[PDB]
């Protein structure tokens, strides 16, 4: 139950470890707000052209 | 700086960095910097 993430030119193929490095620091706010939750998780989606 | 990390935010710099390893005399470097088109500089850097 989280708002969509900013893929920003980064393909994450199924069952293929990948790294994401956005230059903006606002997505880190969402990554630190999930630390108190019991299970922390995130979804990965794809962008259009 | 791997080609699989997709951290090459500036490809021109990666091609220049790869051409920097060449041992070609300075003149060759100046000539390659004069080159404006992309396949010529990549082709020449590979040639060096």
From Swiss-Prot, chain B:
Duodenum, heart, lung and liver, but not thymus. It is found in: Mitochondrion matrix. ATP-dependent serine protease that mediates the selective degradation of misfolded, unassembled or oxidatively damaged polypeptides as well as certain short-lived regulatory proteins in the mitochondrial matrix. Endogenous substrates include mitochondrial steroidogenic acute regulatory (StAR) protein, DELE1, helicase Twinkle (TWNK) and the large ribosomal subunit protein MRPL32/bL32m. MRPL32/bL32m is protected from degradation by LONP1 when it is bound to a nucleic acid (RNA), but TWNK is not. May also have a chaperone function in the assembly of inner membrane protein complexes. Homohexamer. Organized in a ring with a central cavity. The ATP-binding and proteolytic domains (AP-domain) form a hexameric chamber, while the N-terminal domain is arranged as a trimer of dimers. DNA and RNA binding is stimulated by substrate and inhibited by ATP binding. Interacts with TWNK and mitochondrial DNA polymerase subunit POLG. It is linked to CODAS syndrome: A rare syndrome characterized by the combination of cerebral, ocular, dental, auricular, and skeletal features. These include developmental delay, craniofacial anomalies, cataracts, ptosis, median nasal groove, delayed tooth eruption, hearing loss, short stature, delayed epiphyseal ossification, metaphyseal hip dysplasia, and vertebral coronal clefts. The Lon N-terminal domains are crucial for the overall structure of the protein, maintaining it in a conformation allowing its proper functioning. The AP-domain (ATP-binding and proteolytic domains) has a closed-ring conformation in the presence of AMP-PNP and its N-terminal entry gate appears closed. Upon ADP binding, it switches to a lock-washer conformation and its N-terminal gate opens. Belongs to the peptidase S16 family. This is Lon protease homolog, mitochondrial. It comes from Homo sapiens. The gene is LONP1.
């Amino acid at each position: 139950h989280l708002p969509l993430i900013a893929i920003t030119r980064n393909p994450v193929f199924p069952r293929f470890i990948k790294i994401i490095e956005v230059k903006n620091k606002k997505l880190v706010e969402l990554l630190r707000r999930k630390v108190r939750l019991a299970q922390p998780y995130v979804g990965v989606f794809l962008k259009r052209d | 700086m791997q080609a699989g990390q997709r951290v090459v935010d500036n490809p021109i710099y990666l091609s220049d960095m790869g051409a920097a390893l060449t041992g070609a005399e300075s003149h060759e470097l100046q000539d390659v910097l004069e080159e404006t088109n992309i396949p010529k500089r990549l082709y020449k850097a590979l040639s060096l």
